[PDB]
Amino acid sequence: GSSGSSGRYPTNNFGNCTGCSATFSVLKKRRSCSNCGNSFCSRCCSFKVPKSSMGATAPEAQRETVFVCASCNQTLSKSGPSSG
């Protein structure tokens, strides 16, 4: 018997960052992750990571660097579960 099911609305927080929940003021710009594709501040989406080893490998993007959110950058860096 193993438990691990979330029973919450199918929607996710909005209007603010999905990491530090820091509203995007006139100064802050709502950025967009490259991996997960979620909204983040200018402090969470400040992580550079390769796309070649993100999900789809191609002879085009090899030495490229994309911006991702900490939450992801951390998951991508270390290995473990099936990227999804």
List residues forming the annotated binding site for Zn(2+): 17, 20, 33, 36, 41, 44, 69, 72
Query: Which residues are at the interface with Zn ion (CB under 5 A)?
Result: 17, 19-20, 33, 35-36, 41, 44, 68-69, 72
Q: Identify the bridge partners of residue 39 per DSSP, sorted by sequence position.
A: 32
In one-letter notation, the amino acid at residue 41 is C
Q: Tell me how far CA of residue 42 lies from CA of 46, 76, 77, in angstroms.
A: 6, 19, 20
CB of 15 to Zn ion, least distance (A): 13
Q: Which is nearer to Zn ion, 4 or 31 (CB)?
A: 31
| Rounded CA separation 29/56 (Å) | 28
Residues marked as binding? 17, 20, 33, 36, 41, 44, 69, 72
Q: Which is nearer to Zn ion, 1 or 26 (CB)?
A: 26
Q: Which is nearer to Zn ion, 61 or 70 (CB)?
A: 70
